[PDB]
Design a protein around this ligand. Sequence first.
Ligand code: MG
Ligand code: MG
Ligand code: ZN
Lengths: 196, 52, 190, 141
Amino acid sequence: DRATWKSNYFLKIIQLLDDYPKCFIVGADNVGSKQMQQIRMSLRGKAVVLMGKNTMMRKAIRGHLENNPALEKLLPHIRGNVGFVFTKEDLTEIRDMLLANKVPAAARAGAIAPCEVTVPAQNTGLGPEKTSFFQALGITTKISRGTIEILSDVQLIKTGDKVGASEATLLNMLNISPFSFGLVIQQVFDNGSIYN
Amino acid sequence: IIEPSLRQLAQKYNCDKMICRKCYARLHPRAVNCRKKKCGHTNNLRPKKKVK
Amino acid sequence: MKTILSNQTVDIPENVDITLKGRTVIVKGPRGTLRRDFNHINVELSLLGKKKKRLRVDKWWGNRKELATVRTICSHVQNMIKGVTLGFRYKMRSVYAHFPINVVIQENGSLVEIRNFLGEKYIRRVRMRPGVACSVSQAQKDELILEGNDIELVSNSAALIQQATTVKNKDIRKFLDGIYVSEKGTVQQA
Amino acid sequence: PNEIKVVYLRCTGGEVGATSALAPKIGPLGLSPKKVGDDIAKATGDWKGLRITVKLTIQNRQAQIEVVPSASALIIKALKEITFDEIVNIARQMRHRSLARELSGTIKEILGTAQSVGCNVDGRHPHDIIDDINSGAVECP
RNA sequence: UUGAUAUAGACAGCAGGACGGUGGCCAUGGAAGUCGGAAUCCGCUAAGGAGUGUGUAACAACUCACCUGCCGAAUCAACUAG
Ligand SMILES: [Mg+2]
Ligand SMILES: [Mg+2]
Ligand SMILES: [Zn+2]
């Protein structure tokens, strides 16, 4: 089965690259699978996302592309988690729609944060039974109109720090988006052209 | 009233440990065979029971 | 099965030079001087280069039981060299449920006493290893900071604190109070 | 937000039951339906299906629209009384039809083997047809 | 001894994904992948079992099997009898 799986992967990239000459290298970041099925659903009529093992695609392009060189510009390039999107349309329009379609993923417990978000002052309106978590985080709250209200603004999370379990849950309960990212494109391959 | 991260820190040394099913030794959570001689280094291992 | 030779080397930084007296390795790092012998292990210690200060350890017909000591010697030296150019620091949080754990540092961090453990009237005096001094952290509320050069002395001193504050005749799954290391870091963060 | 949101679904359908329904247990979540809310939610969602019939209930400040999320299972068991080839095809076309599909050949076999416990046309089980999917491979577009 | 994996990059660590119908059907009082009975499909695939465990009344939140990233050379399993 494994021998079958690899070989049909080889002919899969070979025939499609011979069918699709222009490509992106897409950073396969911490991207949930629910978004990946969605990102192609938004892309179903236009393109397809495709990736794999970093050497899986590599030996595919050295082992079967001596017939047509000039695709070897990527041989340095494929490092880390990467991805190949394959449209036959223009570059910038297909560039931004992948960038624009970003899903506000939650803050997984144990993941570094690149963004700094601080809550503003407001009455969240949830039930007045989760007040114990706020005491753990240090903020003092009181019951106004039978709901949880935060008195003052305190710092929530800075960039490049480890998140906490109770904070991770409380951020989700407030329904306030944390630092979030989706598929990010590094640079572009357009028939032997290199562009960021 | 302990902050949960401190509780987990304590749980690392007191709760999160392996117990040998023959000699009741205290082993690190990744143990596969008991380190003691008096049971013959069995692989019969059970986790320490939690207070949940 | 007797192997022909098993060997592995380490790379010594410039700031510390290493002197070899038989099977005794002496380091001359900036933070001080630490000496340790290895006469209980039959090996070959040799300094390699006068330009990059490499030290090599051989085994020469060791069985798999004594094949393991080769890396152990190097690891000891690696911790040994790191301890004299960087130092050691094992931050020690103090967790307590109801009775606040009261610790006061005695002379030069050479003696420490834990006073209010679980509300006992007993006073727990514990002496850490010479060359290891403790210190109350100032960044946050209750955590002891102890420094030193040798990992064994600092660790064993740290373990002394951890074992001294223990609960007797009660569930240790509850009553989680005590003093335990939080992280085994270093000094100068270099 | 829409002047009311009691979106929370319910996994009861078919026969009324009234008391056997779990509306009192979930009622204090939005405070709108109560006992009568079950009565008005059930009357419209009594049949099709006459089964468990998990339903999506969007509130109407006291009333609801009992849109049944079209799972494969809820309709195939209900329509079973045997071929149902066009019947499953038309049941397939009425759904949300997302299924992370790429083509129609994808979605036909999705609803096909979904009733491995619910059989298929005449004297055959929903898997051998899935192998040689040729009849109607492009019929819906 | 037999078998298995491996530069088409093993293994172990460190880090990601771990899905749509579908909170699949019969169970129901709640079981939503995981108290019980049957099934095993689809697409996307990088993989995701209409589910290996923790667990929630349930949710959920984790872990797993399965793939991917870093790491670049051998590694793993089941037996056997001294
Ligand atoms: Mg080590
Ligand atoms: Mg007792
Ligand atoms: Zn034992």
